[PDB]
């Protein structure tokens, strides 16, 4: 079924197949009505125009609410397999098969097309009711099939005889490809084919003289191979319109990003473009780019991106130069270049000002924090602080925003969490973002919906209620990851959870091997901290604390200046507390534990309050004053069983007291 591919603005052989089907359905002589699902799989990809920005926008409208079958490749083998499935589909399948056999000439093609325009297609409904004398079903222009057939009619009267010959030379090539196929052998003889073929072949007006030599014209052109064939220019094996190519490509990249498709056929066919249709179809370049990132090829990613943004900008009259840099900026942030991405972004701001268009500034601002969300360590380097944006976007407008406010509040929630604000405000801020996101369609805005889950899971986990987190985590998508953050980040993130479990099950060999990968990998900041946090926990289990103690303090000291992450500061502080008290000297930590207790009492996070209580209890029992420790733990035992993961520590301490 493979062959050279070329974009054609004329009637592709695939197109006639629908025209074959619609003829049988409207004729109503055979009583064969093609099922509606068949048409909606065939015509709909040919419906024009979808558009798909390279990055900076993911499936904002491409996702169909109902799952649709993949678009069909223009090969008789694939087309027939759709009709073939039904028990009576053989009858429908043979109807198509017979018509393709009856159509043996360019004139016969014209007979089909003249028939539809004169009788089947009709300008408007008001003439339906007057045409009750028609033995065939009549079509309205505005209908689903009507608008399609109008386009097909237009594409036939649009060209000279030069295009009509290409239709027939290609169709016979297209028809004969199916002939040397195993399925055609299964349908070598079906008697019904002759019946349907003779239905339309009738009224030939000659059977004795012209038919003797009519065959001679057909056969001589055809490759009878008795002699050397008539030499003709190389002809393409498959012809598709631009719009049909758009559907197959968009489905392929979406399927790749996260009823069976034919990846090999699509990829092979897309590799035979004459390099001119590639100009007419710039999206072929980016299809390599998405493939390029998968194997982590740097230069091969770059040239493709530059390739895509040169043909797109010229084709579209609106200035998209202000969009090219951001995609390139995303690409650099994808390879952790970071600093180079920074320079890329600044000149995007200047370009936006010259265009003097307001709507693009919202797009450039929204990209800022999305970048800083991945790399919070770069907040100081931007010319605008994060808080300025939130204040700006909160009062941006009251209309023509839709998703901006949903984006606006989530950034405040993240900042509010990191700034360790009081839980009352954080709950309210997340409330705003939750209400606005769910109010509109959440399925269509798949990116933000996932981000909501991540924040909520994180938020409730910090409060210590895994029961709530357990419900939400089932909605978190794995391996989906997000844009502008690498491509193997999901693999790394999954691996880290493995290491933590391995640490719990005392699999020191596996975790040890993973830390070796740590020092030479390019990792995101959030990933970096986890491994940085992973190492200190591992060193505690081994027993060496001189190295860890010098290591933990460096981490927390740099966890307060470079990034003002209070949550990660807390987790590191308590590890140091564990290190001290484990070495029989936790008394040094008494100043440190107390200053956090009253500090978090004001905050009101119960999980924080309880964990320090256990540490306070543990230090008091290694002193020899376990008497009062028992008294304190007795009064607070009720409120400390609410948190699951501390129960194991809480239970274990109980037998110690006995």
């Amino acid at each position: 079924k493979y062959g050279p591919l070329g974009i054609t603005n004329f009637i592709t052989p695939y197109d006639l197949c629908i025209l074959i089907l619609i003829h049988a359905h409207c004729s109503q002589d055979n009583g064969i009505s093609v099922p509606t699902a068949v048409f909606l799989r065939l015509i709909s990809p040919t419906r024009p125009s979808l558009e798909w920005n390279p990055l900076l926008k993911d499936n904002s409208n491409l996702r169909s609410s109902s799952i649709v079958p993949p678009p069909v490749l223009p090969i008789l083998d694939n087309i027939i397999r759709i009709l073939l499935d039904d028990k009576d589909g053989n009858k429908i399948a043979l109807t198509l098969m017979g018509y393709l056999e009856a159509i043996n000439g360019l004139d016969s093609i014209n007979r089909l097309m003249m028939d539809l325009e004169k009788n089947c297609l009709v300008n408007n409904y008001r003439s339906m009711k007057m045409r009750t004398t028609s033995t065939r079903r009549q079509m309205t222009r505005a209908s689903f099939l009507g608008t399609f057939l109008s386009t097909c009619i237009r594409k036939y009267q649009i060209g000279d005889f030069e295009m009509r010959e290409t239709i027939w030379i290609n169709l016979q090539n297209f028809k004969t490809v199916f002939k040397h196929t195993p399925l055609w052998l299964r349908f070598k003889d079906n008697v019904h084919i002759q019946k349907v073929k003779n239905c339309l072949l009738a009224n030939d007006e000659i059977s004795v003289e012209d038919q003797q030599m009519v065959e001679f014209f057909q056969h001589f052109n055809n490759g009878n191979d008795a002699d050397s064939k008539t030499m003709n220019e190389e002809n393409y094996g498959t012809l598709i319109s631009i719009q049909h190519l758009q559907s197959i490509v968009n489905r392929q990249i979406v399927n790749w990003l996260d009823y069976e498709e034919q990846s090999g056929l699509v990829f092979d066919l897309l590799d035979t473009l004459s390099l001119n249709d590639a100009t007419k179809f710039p999206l072929i370049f980016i299809l390599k780019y998405l493939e390029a990132i998968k194997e982590n090829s740097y230069q091969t990613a770059l040239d493709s991106l530059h390739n895509y943004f040169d043909y797109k900008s010229t084709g579209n009259s609106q200035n998209y130069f202000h969009i090219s840099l951001l995609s390139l900026a995303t690409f650099h942030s994808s390879f952790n270049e970071c600093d180079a991405a920074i320079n890329s972004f600044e000149e995007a701001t200047r370009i936006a000002r010259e265009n003097k268009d307001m709507e693009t500034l919202n797009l450039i601002m929204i990209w800022i924090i999305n970048f800083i969300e991945v790399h919070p360590e770069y907040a100081n380097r931007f010319y605008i602080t994060v808080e300025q944006i939130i204040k700006y976007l909160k009062n941006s407008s009251d209309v023509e925003d839709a998703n901006i406010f949903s984006n606006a509040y989530k950034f405040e929630t993240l900042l509010s969490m990191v700034k360790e604000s009081k839980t009352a405000e954080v709950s309210s801020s997340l409330l705003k973002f939750m209400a606005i996101t769910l109010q509109n369609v959440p399925s269509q805005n798949f990116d933000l919906f996932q981000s909501l889950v991540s924040y909520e899971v994180k938020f409730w986990k910090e409060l210590g209620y895994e029961s709530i987190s357990d419900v939400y985590e089932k909605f978190l998508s794995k391996t989906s990851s997000s844009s502008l953050r690498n491509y193997d980040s999901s693999i790394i993130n999954q691996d880290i959870k493995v290491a933590f479990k391995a640490l719990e099950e005392d699999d020191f060999l596996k975790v040890k091997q993973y830390l070796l990968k740590s020092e030479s990998l390019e990792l995101d900041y959030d990933q970096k901290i986890n491994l940085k946090y992973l190492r200190v926990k591992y060193l505690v289990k081994i027993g060496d604390y001189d190295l860890s103690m010098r290591l933990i303090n460096q981490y927390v000291k740099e966890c307060c200046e470079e990034v003002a992450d209070s949550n990660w500061r807390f987790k590191f502080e308590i590890e140091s507390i564990n290190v001290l008290l484990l070495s029989d000297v936790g008394i040094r930590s008494l100043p440190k534990i107390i200053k956090l207790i009253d500090e978090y009492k004001e905050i009101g996070n119960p999980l924080r309050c309880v964990i320090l209580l256990l540490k306070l209890c543990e230090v008091l029992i290694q002193v020899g004053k376990s008497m009062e420790a028992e008294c304190l733990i007795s009064c607070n035992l009720s409120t400390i069983l609410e948190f699951p993961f501390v129960r194991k520590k809480t239970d274990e301490l109980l037998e110690s007291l006995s």
């Binding site: 084709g315 009259s317 609106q318 009251d398 209309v399």
Partner: protein, 96 residues
């Protein structure tokens, strides 16, 4: 693209609280006449991208009557000093 107003809730609250230049592309430029194609309507610009099929559709539609509208104006037969463009204008006044 709900614009925050297609949302029933926030739209309700707002009521209570109240109380493009075109530039040619390469494919637009043709080989015969150096004037580039100018699209007739914004429908022919597909998200700003000039659809090549619609462009050539209008081009065919313009040229098709051009063969028919040939004999108008300048061409004059001999023995008739009066071209056919005014043969129908007098013909129009004849019945009217």
């Amino acid at each position: 693209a709900r614009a925050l107003r297609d949302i029933s809730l926030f739209n309700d609250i707002r009521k209570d609280q109240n109380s493009v230049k075109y530039i040619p592309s390469l494919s637009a430029y043709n080989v015969f006449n150096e004037f580039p194609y100018y699209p007739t309507s914004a429908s022919q610009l597909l998200d700003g991208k000039l659809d090549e099929f619609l462009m050539l559709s209008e081009q065919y539609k313009s040229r098709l009557p051009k063969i028919r509208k040939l004999g108008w104006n300048r061409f004059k037969p001999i023995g008739i000093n009066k071209t056919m463009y005014e043969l129908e204008m007098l013909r129009s006044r004849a019945r009217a």
